[PDB]
From a paper:
Protein tyrosine phosphatase 1B (PTP1B) is a negative regulator of leptin signaling in the hypothalamus, where it dephosphorylates the active site of leptin receptor–associated Janus kinase 2 and decreases signal transducer and activator of transcription 3 (STAT3) phosphorylation and transcription of the anorectic neuropeptide, pro-opiomelanocortin (POMC). As such, there has been substantial interest in the development of PTP1B inhibitors for the treatment of obesity. Focusing on the variants in and near the ordered catalytic domain, we ascribed structural mechanisms to their functional effects using in vitro enzyme activity assays, room-temperature X-ray crystallography, and local hydrogen–deuterium exchange mass spectrometry. By combining these complementary structural biology experiments for multiple variants, we characterize an inherent allosteric network in PTP1B that differs from previously reported allosteric inhibitor–driven mechanisms mediated by catalytic loop motions.
Some of these variants are located near known allosteric sites: for example, D245G and Q78R are adjacent to the conformationally bistable loop 16, which is known to be allosterically linked to the bistable, dynamic, catalytically essential WPD loop in the active site. Compared with WT, D245G and Q78R significantly decreased catalysis in vitro, consistent with them having the most extensive LOF effects in cells. Somewhat surprisingly, I19V also decreased catalysis in vitro, despite having no statistically significant effects in cells. These mutations decrease kcat but do not change Km, consistent with allosteric effects from their locations distal from the active site. FoldX mutational scanning applied to multiple crystal structures predicted destabilization for D245G (median ΔΔG ≈ +3.2 kcal/mol), whereas Q78R, P302Q, and I19V had only moderate effects (ΔΔG between −0.4 and +1.5 kcal/mol). The mutations were evident in 2Fo–Fc and Fo–Fc electron density maps for D245G and I19V. For D245G, the difference features exclude the I19 area but otherwise span a similar region of PTP1B, including the D245G mutation site and parts of the β sheet and active site. In addition, D245G increases exchange markedly for the mutation locus itself, consistent with FoldX computational predictions and room-temperature crystallography. It also decreases exchange dramatically for the active-site pTyr recognition loop, consistent with D245G exhibiting the most extensive functional impacts in vitro and in cells.
Residue numbers in the entry: 2 to 285
The structure:
């Protein structure tokens, strides 16, 4: 039982210690493509890079590089693409990746400005009548509708491949209330958001992998994928208490470095899974 695990760590105040064991135990694989000089301006942070073996490749000949990783959770039948918040010069690459990977949903866990600094380019349109065109990748993006709620916003976007004149509907799920510092006090609104993403079909295997990002694509983004996969495994397994958060987290870190950036995010991830378990053990 992980509810017990939680009390013992919390009573002992040993979150920082747990977190360090994860750090020391985590995989390290080469990131040679990310560190090429021609890609320096495609990385928002010098210390956050995709591993070569799991990086997403753009279907480009000049430069196929984008700071994005495929997380493949085989037992759960879930795949995610985790990426950084786009830079002013990588918005076209971002939407190219969504197109090429056949994704249905984009999950955004940050605000464009936090702590007085820009964390992400404004990569979607803010008004229906002012569409965006990405000339480098030949894509057009139109805002179709926007549903603003207290904790999150959902947008319907139309992505058009100008080369083929094909169009696809993309759902943008934007969690807007993650605090500038720390983690939410309660996981309730985070879990409600996660279940809205689930209910949309965006995580389902008929579609390409959902795209998840925050600023670096490892902290908040990691919390989202970890909670979703843990809750799914507790639905699937004969023994739900066989699901270990630390084991799942180390498996995901084989695919992208640094997932879960602070001991507070680790604690929050436990809280979200524990609370979410109450709903998937059957509270209709
Ligand atoms: Mg208007």
């Amino acid at each position: 039982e992980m509810e017990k695990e939680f009390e013992q760590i919390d009573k002992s105040g040993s979150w920082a210690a747990i977190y360090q064991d994860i750090r020391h135990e985590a995989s390290d694989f080469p990131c040679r493509v990310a560190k090429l000089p021609k890609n320096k301006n495609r990385n928002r942070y010098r210390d956050v890079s995709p591993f070569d073996h799991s990086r997403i490749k753009l279907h480009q000949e000049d430069n196929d590089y984008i700071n994005a990783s495929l997380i493949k959770m085989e037992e759960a039948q879930r795949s995610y693409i985790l990426t950084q918040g786009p830079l002013p010069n990588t918005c076209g690459h971002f939407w190219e990746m969504v197109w090429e990977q056949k994704s249905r949903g984009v999950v955004m866990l940050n605000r464009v400005m936090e702590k007085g600094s820009l964390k992400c380019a404004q990569y979607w349109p803010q008004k229906e009548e002012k569409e965006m065109i990405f000339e480098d990748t030949n894509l057009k993006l139109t805002l179709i509708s926007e549903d603003i709620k207290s904790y999150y916003t959902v947008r319907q976007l139309e992505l058009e491949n100008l080369t083929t004149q094909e169009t696809r509907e993309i759902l943008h799920f934007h969690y807007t209330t993650w605090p500038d510092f720390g983690v939410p006090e309660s996981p309730a609104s985070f879990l409600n958001f996660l279940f809205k993403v689930r209910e949309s079909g965006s995580l389902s295997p008929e579609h390409g992998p959902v795209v998840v990002h925050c600023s670096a694509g490892i902290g908040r983004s990691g919390t989202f994928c970890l909670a979703d996969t843990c809750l799914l495994l507790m639905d699937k397994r004969k023994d739900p208490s066989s699901v270990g958060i630390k084991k799942v987290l180390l498996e995901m870190r084989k695919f992208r470095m640094g997932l879960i950036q602070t001991a507070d995010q680790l604690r929050f991830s436990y809280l979200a899974v524990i609370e979410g378990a109450k709903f998937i053990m059957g509270d209709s």
